[PDB]
Amino acid sequence: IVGGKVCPKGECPWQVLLLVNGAQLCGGTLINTIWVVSAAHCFDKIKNWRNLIAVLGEHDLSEHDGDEQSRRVAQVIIPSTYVPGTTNHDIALLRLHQPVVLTDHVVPLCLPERTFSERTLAFVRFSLVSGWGQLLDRGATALELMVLNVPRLMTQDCLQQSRNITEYMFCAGYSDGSKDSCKGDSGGPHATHYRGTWYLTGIVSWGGCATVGHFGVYTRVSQYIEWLQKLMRSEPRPGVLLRAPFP
Amino acid sequence: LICVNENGGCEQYCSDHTGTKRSCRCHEGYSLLADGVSCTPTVEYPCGKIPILEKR
Ligand SMILES: O=C(NCc1cccc(-n2ncc(-c3cc4cnccc4[nH]3)c2O)c1)[C@@H](O)CO
Ligand SMILES: [Ca+2]
Ligand SMILES: [Cl-]
């Protein structure tokens, strides 16, 4: 995250850190005790699908404080329409091997109904994006979780104000090079507040970090609500990676 | 009251029905109050609320 602030510990309790062989891979968003939403492209180069870990309740990567909860990732589900190394349909649904325990530091973000998200949440101007990604373009990643308030653009306006955005994406952020999500943040939440509750509206996608003349691009979660809900009602299948028909 | 305008007055989710009829609904872990619009938590850790801020 470029140009944000530290998310005070416990104020982003849905944020997930994904690790592969102990190394930072991507962010994610907890939506229930066993389900995490992330970005498909995070998994383009995974060799050993059995060494993927999700961490909840994380804050400062330099220390252990006892609020962290780690789980093996049992399933990574990716839409059939996603093509590796591209941006469209950049979403993944992850099943944890065992539920996390909800606590003051571990709480799911609400996955909204499609109608509500399209009719109401899509018109809330500002939303929060968070992660442990790069603090600067070509810079080091963050040790404490960072958060940034970004305004959403209608796609017509994003194209005009920009010095390929599909119906499965939206733009948000700033064109002045000061504030953006960055490498290391992909998969994390774009969270929208409405009448006292926060909802998942976007996933940090890729990929140009706080580049003048350009906005951040986010996966438009509203397009995937029904796809996600059907998969969460399904039984697990052997083998970690599952490609599931979309729509 | 239509769901497209002002969320139908609903705090959370809204369904249009046959006639001048609307029903609000709440996410799992919430219940709808007798006003027909407001949602109140029914569990300790409902989705989308920040415990350290709700306690403060
Ligand atoms: O192609 C690959 N796929 C894997 C893989 C995994 C995990 C992460 C990345 N990955 N690389 C770059 C970015 C990224 C840039 C960016 C700008 N603005 C907002 C969010 C942004 N994210 C990113 O998320 C790739 C490589 O691994 C090639 O080796
Ligand atoms: Ca820690
Ligand atoms: Cl586990």
At A128, the amino acid letter reads: L
A186 lines ligand 1 (CB under 6 A): yes
The ligand that comes nearest to the alpha carbon of residue A105 is 2
Resolution (A): 1.4
Phi, psi of A50, rounded to the nearest 5 degrees? -85, -5
How far does the CA of residue A196 sit from the closest CA of chain B (Å)?
8
Residues B53, A7 contacting (CB under 8 angstroms): no
> Is A116 close to B11, i.e. CB distance below 8 A?
no
Joined tokens for residue A223? 């397009």
Of A102, A196, A198, the CB nearest to B45: A102
Which positions in chain B touch A120 (Cβ < 8 Å)? 7
Report in angstroms the alpha-carbon separations of A29 from A38, A83, A138, A235, B18: 6, 22, 25, 21, 37
Question: Chain-centre distance of CA B38, in angstroms?
Answer: 5
In angstroms, how far is the first alpha carbon of chain A from the final one? 31
- Mapped onto helix, strand or coil, the DSSP state of residue B55 is helix
Please name the CATH architecture into which domain A1-12+109-222 falls: Beta Barrel (2.40)
What 3 state SS string does chain A have?
A: CECCEECCCCCCCCEEEEEECCEEEEEEEECCCCEEEECHHHHCCCCCHHHEEEEECCCECCCCCCCCEEEEEEEEEEECCCCCCCCCCCCEEEEECCCCCCECCECCCECCCHHHHHHCHHHCCEEEEEECCECCCCCCECCECEEEEEEEECHHHHHHHCCCCCCCEEEECCCCCCCECCCCCCCCEEEEEECCEEEEEEEECCCCCCCCCCCEEEEEHHHHHHHHHHHHCCCCCCCCEEEECCC
At A184, the amino acid letter reads: G
- Asked if A1-12+109-222 and A13-108+223-236 have one fold, the answer is yes
Joined tokens for residue A238? 């052997």
Which positions in chain A touch B55 (Cβ < 8 Å)? 104
Report in angstroms the alpha-carbon separations of A89 from A156, A185, B33, B54: 19, 17, 38, 35
Q: What are the domain boundaries of chain A?
A: 1-12+109-222, 13-108+223-236
CATH class held by domain B1-56: mainly beta
Write down the residue that tokens 């109401």 correspond to. Answer: A120
The approach used to solve this structure was: X-ray
How far does the CA of residue A108 sit from the closest CA of chain B (Å)?
5
- Residue A209 CA neighbour count, 13 Å, CB half: 19
Of A225, A181, A227, A232, the C-alpha closest to A207 is A181
A178 in catalytic set? no
Residue of A89, A90, A205, A214 with catalytic role? A90
CATH class held by domain A13-108+223-236: mainly beta
Q: What are the domain boundaries of chain B?
A: 1-56
Which positions in chain B touch A197 (Cβ < 8 Å)? 11-12, 27, 39, 47-49
> Is B11 close to A13, i.e. CB distance below 8 A?
no
At A50, the amino acid letter reads: R
Question: Chain-centre distance of CA A246, in angstroms?
Answer: 19
Distance A114 CA to ligand 1 centre (A): 28
A181 lines ligand 1 (CB under 6 A): yes
CA distance A26 to A182: 11
Of B4, B39, B47, the CB nearest to A119: B4
Of A191, A184, A182, the C-alpha closest to A217 is A182
A209 lines ligand 1 (CB under 6 A): yes
